[PDB]
From a paper:
Several potent bNAbs bind a conserved HCV glycoprotein E2 epitope using an unusual heavy chain complementarity determining region 3 (HCDR3) containing an intra-loop disulfide bond. Here we report the identification of new antibodies containing an HCDR3 disulfide bond motif using computational screening with the Rosetta software. The tip of the HCDR3 loop in previously characterized VH1-69-derived, HCDR3 disulfide bond motif-containing Abs forms a β-hairpin that interacts with an epitope in the front layer of E2. The Ab HCDR3 loops interact with E2 mostly through backbone-backbone interactions of the β-hairpin at the tip of the loop.
However, there is also a possibility that these Abs were indeed elicited in response to HCV infection and contain additional mutations that facilitate correct placement of these HCDR3 loops and/or shape other regions for interaction with the antigen. Moreover, both HEPC3.1 and HEPC3.4 originated from the subject C110 sequence pool but were discovered using the bNAb HEPC3, isolated from the subject C117, as a search template, confirming that the P3SM approach can successfully identify Abs that evolved independently for binding the same epitope. Contrary to our expectations, both structures revealed a bent HCDR3 conformation like the one previously found in the AR3C, AR3A, and HC11 bNAbs, rather than an extended (straight) loop as seen in the HEPC3 mAb that was used as a template for this P3SM search. An overlay of the HEPC3.1 and HEPC3.4 Fab HCDR3 loop tips with known Ab co-crystal structures does not reveal significant clashes. In support of our hypothesis, the conformational space sampled by HEPC3.1 and HEPC3.4 is only sparsely populated with HEPC3-like straight HCDR3 loop conformations independent of the starting conformation. For example, HEPC3.4-VN sampled HEPC3-like straight HCDR3 loop conformation more often. However, it was not the dominant conformation for this Ab.
Author numbering:
A (entry chain A): 1 to 52, 52A, 53 to 82, 82A, 82B, 82C, 83 to 100, 100A, ...
B (entry chain B): 9 to 211
Write the structure that this text describes.
């Protein structure tokens, strides 16, 4: 009710099962008052389910009346969200939020959500972990960059000159290939006199594979 | 889903409904990278802590949410939430973008790295740097053959200090398919470009 706190990122495989928690810590709480809204990357929101006040068991959206099961542990005050038959369209950020009921004219209550959990990311692809590939991008107000071209899953960091260069640096949002791996490119604009006079090195760290590669760029 | 405005303009977002949801529409605000927070509930009830610029109205079918004067921390996405016995929807969302004057894209092209061609894949990078508005289209040409299906645009969010976008279209071929062609032209057209810029290279 004051501090909805969620489990953490889960990579899963098609046909599989995720179970996400929502801690609802702090002061007085009702774990039966937590609902679950889902957000699919790049676009808007859809509520998934809540819990019936008169029954104590879940109530879910028509699009998930199949294999969803939210459960409310009243003592430990958490809400577990279990989504199975995972597909690729089910890859999204899953929020929990405390429902403030305003009208219940079924067996279900709905009204508005006040505290929202921090959100856990469920990436589900048929692919498996792989480290990134770094390809330098050379210069001819002159730009240079690095291409991180085939890794999985999403989280990857890019630095320049081991942290010094932070001006004109960009690093774009990654794109997902039909193959299944992620690729992003990071560029920086630098003056045409510091070509050769200053060496530019980018640092790429992909912890999911413990891959920390650095590749420098020369004209 | 997108509205461009600058600090001190007044924006009001209408959110119509199909049936009669009386007073059960809420407004949420979402900033990139964070969960939603409620601003108004019960159509008009400001939630404690949200500034007084925010003003929700309407009843029955047409519902509004106004900001009397935009401030820097007002530029985020706003969803209206229907929640009735008739409809139980969220919104498409409406993104307020921070307005500026048009900027011409600084273009760059990057032929495949020597180290990359050793892998059998050959990826060509184009780069559009610091532009406004976001609306810009790149066009890949290989020997005057127009490309449409191997490229992959990805664009940033409005810069914190430039209020400008940067777009990076990447054309990826197989090493083999790469060697068959001479000209690799990346044509970009923008609002702030008097005539479309092309940045070619011969392999």
């Amino acid at each position: 009710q004051v501090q909805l706190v969620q489990s953490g990122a889960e990579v899963k495989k098609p046909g599989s099962s995720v179970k996400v928690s929502c801690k609802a810590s702090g002061g007085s709480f009702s774990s039966n008052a937590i609902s679950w809204v889902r957000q699919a990357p790049g676009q808007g929101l859809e509520w998934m389910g809540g819990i019936n006040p008169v029954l104590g068991i879940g109530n879910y959206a028509e699009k998930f009346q199949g294999r969803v099961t939210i459960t409310a542990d009243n003592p430990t005050s958490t809400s577990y969200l279990e989504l199975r038959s995972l597909r690729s369209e089910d890859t999204a950020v899953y929020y929990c939020a405390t429902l403030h009921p305003r009208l219940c004219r079924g067996g279900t209550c709905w009204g508005w959500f006040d505290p929202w959990g921090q959100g856990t990311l469920v990436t589900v692809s048929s692919a498996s972990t792989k480290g990134p590939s770094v390809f330098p991008l050379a210069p001819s107000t002159a730009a240079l960059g690095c291409l991180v071209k085939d890794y999985f899953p999403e989280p990857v960091t890019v630095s320049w000159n081991s942290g010094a260069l932070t001006s004109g640096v960009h690093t774009f949002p990654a794109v997902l290939q039909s193959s299944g791996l992620y690729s992003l490119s990071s560029v920086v604009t630098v003056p045409s006199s510091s070509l050769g006079t200053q060496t530019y090195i980018c640092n790429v760290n992909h912890k999911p594979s413990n891959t920390k590669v650095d590749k420098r760029v020369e004209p | 889903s997108s509205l461009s405005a600058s600090v001190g303009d007044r924006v009001t977002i209408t959110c119509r409904a199909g049936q009669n949801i009386n007073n059960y529409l809420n407004w949420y605000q979402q900033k990139p990278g964070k969960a939603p927070k409620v601003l108004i509930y019960a159509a008009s009830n400001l939630q404690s802590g949200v500034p007084s610029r925010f003003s929700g109205s309407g009843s029955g079918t047409d519902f509004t949410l106004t900001i009397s004067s935009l401030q820097p921390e007002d530029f985020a996405t706003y969803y209206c939430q229907q929640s009735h016995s008739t409809v139980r929807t969220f919104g498409q969302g409406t993104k307020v973008e921070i307005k500026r004057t048009v900027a011409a894209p600084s273009v760059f092209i990057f032929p495949p790295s020597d180290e990359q061609l050793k892998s059998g894949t050959a990826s060509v990078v184009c780069l559009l740097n610091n532009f406004y508005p976001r609306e810009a289209k790149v066009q890949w040409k290989v020997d005057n053959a127009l490309q449409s299906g191997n490229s992959q645009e990805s664009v940033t969010e409005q810069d914190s200090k430039d209020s400008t976008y940067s777009l990076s279209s990447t054309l990826t071929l197989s090493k083999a398919d790469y060697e068959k062609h001479k000209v690799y032209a990346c044509e970009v057209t923008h609002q702030g470009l008097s005539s479309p810029v092309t940045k070619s290279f011969n392999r």
